[PDB]
Amino acid sequence: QREVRLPSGGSIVIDPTEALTSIDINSAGGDIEETALNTNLEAADEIARQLRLRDLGGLVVIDFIDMTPVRHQREVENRLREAVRVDRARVQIGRISRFGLLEMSRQR
Amino acid sequence: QREVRLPSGGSIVIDPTEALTSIDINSAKGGDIEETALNTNLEAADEIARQLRLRDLGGLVVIDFIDMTPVRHQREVENRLREAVRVDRARVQIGRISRFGLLEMSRQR
User: Fold this and answer.
1) Which chain B residues contact residue A99 at CB under 8 A?
2) What are phi and psi of B39, to 5 degrees?
3) Which domain holds residue A14?
4) Hey, how many other C-beta atoms are within 10 angstroms of the C-beta on A106?
5) Do B17 and A22 touch (CB under 8 A)?
6) Burial zone of A86 (CB within 10 Å; 0-12 exposed, 13-18 middle, 19+ buried)
7) Which SS3 state, helix, strand or coil, does residue B15 take?
8) Could you give phi then psi for residue B30, rounded to 5 degrees?
9) Strand A20-26 vs strand A58-63: parallel, antiparallel, or unpaired?
10) Which residues on A lie below 8 Å from B60 (Cβ)?
11) Residues preceding gaps in chain B (C to N > 2.5 Å)
């Protein structure tokens, strides 16, 4: 319930706090950047599903595995935005910061 | 030790997690809330810098400052935190308050 395993072996850890929900992403060898991208894309889909099941509201901070190509960062952000558009709750998604964190909000 | 009181009665709540430490800022009746919000956030900035060193916190820290509309107020709080940590022996990176009202920073423990 706190740790959700991803299809390729990695996992997401959902930690509630007073101000917000923090989500950590862990990877499971091939190429790092390609496994990081793959794990982060699997994480985006699972995060969207968990936001709905647990019906989380307020601010969410996601620590995706660091990727160097900016295009990879946009691909993960876009994956998360597409994954949540079916959610009935209004969702706002920021951009990955220089600290490798993504901020988002969900009303309800 | 999870909750630290601020001079004007407000408080900061520190919650360590897998990926980062989150810090929530709580205010303490008829006065302009903006000046109240700024004062609390400025006291919180000083207390956060103190707790970072005292607990020797490492990694990413996300701070939820009370929301302020004036961009000048946001920079004052950001500048207060940068000045409050410049004496810290540890290497510190400080971001800016986002459109979500959160500030990200990092401290090399």
Assistant:
1) 60, 93, 95, 104-106
2) -60, -50
3) 3-106
4) 20
5) yes
6) exposed
7) strand
8) 110, -5
9) parallel
10) 63, 99, 101
11) 28
Q: In what order do the strands lie in the sheet with B3-5?
A: B3-5, B11-16, B20-26, B59-64, B102-107, B92-94
- Minimum-distance CB partner of A20 among B22, B93, B95: B22
Its sign, for the CA torsion B73, B80, B66, A98, is positive
Judged by CB atoms closer than 8 Å, whether chains meet at B60 and A98 is answered as no
Q: Does B39 touch chain A (CB under 8 A)?
A: no
Token pair in block for residue B34: 């903006």
Say which of B24, B95, B100 has its CB closest to residue A99. B95
Element (H, E) at B77: helix B71-85
Q: Is A3 an 8 Å CB contact of chain B? A: no
Q: How many domains does chain A have?
A: 1
Q: Does B79 touch chain A (CB under 8 A)?
A: no
Report how this structure was experimentally obtained.
X-ray
PDB resolution in Å: 1.9
